[PDB]
Amino acid sequence: RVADTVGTGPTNSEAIPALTAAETGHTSQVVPGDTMQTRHVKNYHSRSESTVENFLCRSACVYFTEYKNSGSKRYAEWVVTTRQAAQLRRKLEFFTYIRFDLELTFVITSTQQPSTTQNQDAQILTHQIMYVPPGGPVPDKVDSYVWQTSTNPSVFWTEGNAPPRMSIPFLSIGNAYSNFYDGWSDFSRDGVYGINTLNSMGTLYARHVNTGGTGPIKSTIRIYFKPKHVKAWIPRPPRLCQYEKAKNVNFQPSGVTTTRQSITAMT
């Protein structure tokens, strides 16, 4: 619940609450009553929806890839990383370090690709989403032994069912995911520099269990990340310039702020 205002009458004293010294770095804790007369108003407003958990708990798509059931791209391979998208990435960046559990949800959508094969009566499609942990064997063809599933966590979802949702516990060798890393993987300081060097969360593979039918069908899989049980440390200024790459913080110089007419203009 937010703090309320306290009444004040006219004042005339040596003490000055307004005049301060911003050089110290202490933001003045001045309430409205300090520089005027105010009534006693009980503010029942609550800072409930501004909580870090409520701020970042919304499901937000990070990456969508499309795999056909017949042709060159039989299966889809995406390295896990929240940097691919923009809205969720920017939300997370606000904090230099962050420690959150994940609740991945997959929205899979099929589409009969235009073709000329007749008597297209396809049976219900079945899909498999496999999470390869880093250092694990990775599939090369749609039907390799890796797809059989030995110990990796995979979910089998027939089309038309409620979208699959598997929760992921915090997965980081360190004590918190580092949103920003001012360091190189190599002690020599030569090589990749940035968040990509320390963040590896495995790879995600999506394939058609059954070909489905005579005609080609293209399956779009959308991956949604919702941070839960989030704890954030060291708040940082929000990214002002548009993102240009996923593996680095490189940016294009942009105006501090959208301009207005004059210094006295009100638009």
Binding site: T20, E23, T24, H26, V30, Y44, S46, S48, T51, D101
Partner: protein, 57 residues
């Protein structure tokens, strides 16, 4: 073993939560945590600066 907590209602009610999965990483989001402390970022000075008193004596 059900945990009963107050629902988020307006100003001026209970709901029952039972943890099904034993993993404990599957628990619902802990939204009801209204705790704050601006001292870490706001007012980070080593020596207290009373607002009424002059800042730089």
């Amino acid at each position: 073993g059900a945990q009963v907590s107050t629902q988020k209602t307006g100003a001026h009610i209970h709901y029952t939560n039972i943890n099904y999965y034993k993993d404990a990483a599957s628990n619902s989001a802990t939204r009801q945590d209204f705790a704050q402390d601006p001292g870490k970022f706001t007012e980070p000075v080593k020596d207290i600066m009373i607002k009424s008193l002059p800042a730089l004596n």
